[PDB]
Amino acid sequence: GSSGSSGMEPAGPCGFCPAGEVQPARYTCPRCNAPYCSLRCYRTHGTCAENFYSGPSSG
Ligand SMILES: [Zn+2]
Ligand SMILES: [Zn+2]
């Protein structure tokens, strides 16, 4: 299982999605490196966003 040089990592097939509805996860969770097709999954995969914003808004 070789590994690509360290620098720029390509996208990944959003697995969180339901079998069949596999989309190219162009983005990834900057907290858990989780490839998500869109914001929708980004929230389903995990609740990392909660402790990410880092703003005085959260309650
Ligand atoms: Zn998805
Ligand atoms: Zn995450």
Side-chain angles (χ1 to χ4, degrees), residues 12-31:
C14 179
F16 307 131
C17 270
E21 302 199 47
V22 176
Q23 287 189 12
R26 286 169 297 205
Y27 324 114
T28 333
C29 207
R31 270 207 90 206

Side-chain angles (χ1 to χ4, degrees), residues 29-34 42 45-49:
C29 207
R31 270 207 90 206
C32 77
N33 198 262
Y42 166 75
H45 90 269
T47 53
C48 314

